[PDB]
Amino acid sequence: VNVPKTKKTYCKSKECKKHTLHKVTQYKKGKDSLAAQGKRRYDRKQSGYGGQTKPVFHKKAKTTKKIVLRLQCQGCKHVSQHPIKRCKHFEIGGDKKGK
């Protein structure tokens, strides 16, 4: 799957509310924070004796992930997220067919 570097799509920002040029980049999940309430509770639950207190997923089945395109509007500098279908090979700004 090849996606163009730029894309002209609708912008939800109240400034634009219209089609504007967007820059395409791939979304990447951020680092998990230690201060998140869920992490704080888990660390408390795991402390002391009792061993592993939560399930640990083992039976992985998917061989791909839903890649999310990060579209940054050039007018308002705001971001919108657009998932695409599953694919094994993905790139942004690759050489187009024939060219």
For Cα atoms 84, 10, 99, give the angle at the middle one, nearest 5 degrees. 60
Q: Is 5 in the site for RNA (CB under 7 A)?
A: no
Record the tokens describing residue 19, joined without a space.
């089609």
List 5, 84, 93, 94, residue binding RNA (CB under 7 A):
84
Question: Which residue number, 15 or 43, has a Cβ lying nearer to K ion?
Answer: 43
- Tell me if 71 sits within 8 A of 3, measured CB to CB: no
Let me know how long the chain is: 99
How far apart are alpha carbons 50 and 69 in whole angstroms? 42
End-to-end distance of the chain based on CA atoms, in angstroms? 16
Q: Is 47 in the site for Mg ion (CB under 5 A)?
A: yes
The 12-51 site mask, x for binding RNA (CB under 7 A), equals xxx--xxx-------x-xxxxx-xxxxx--x--------x
Q: Is 48 in the site for K ion (CB under 5 A)?
A: yes
What residues make contact with RNA under the rule CB under 7 A?
1, 4, 7-10, 12-14, 17-19, 27, 29-33, 35-39, 42, 51-66, 68, 70, 78-86
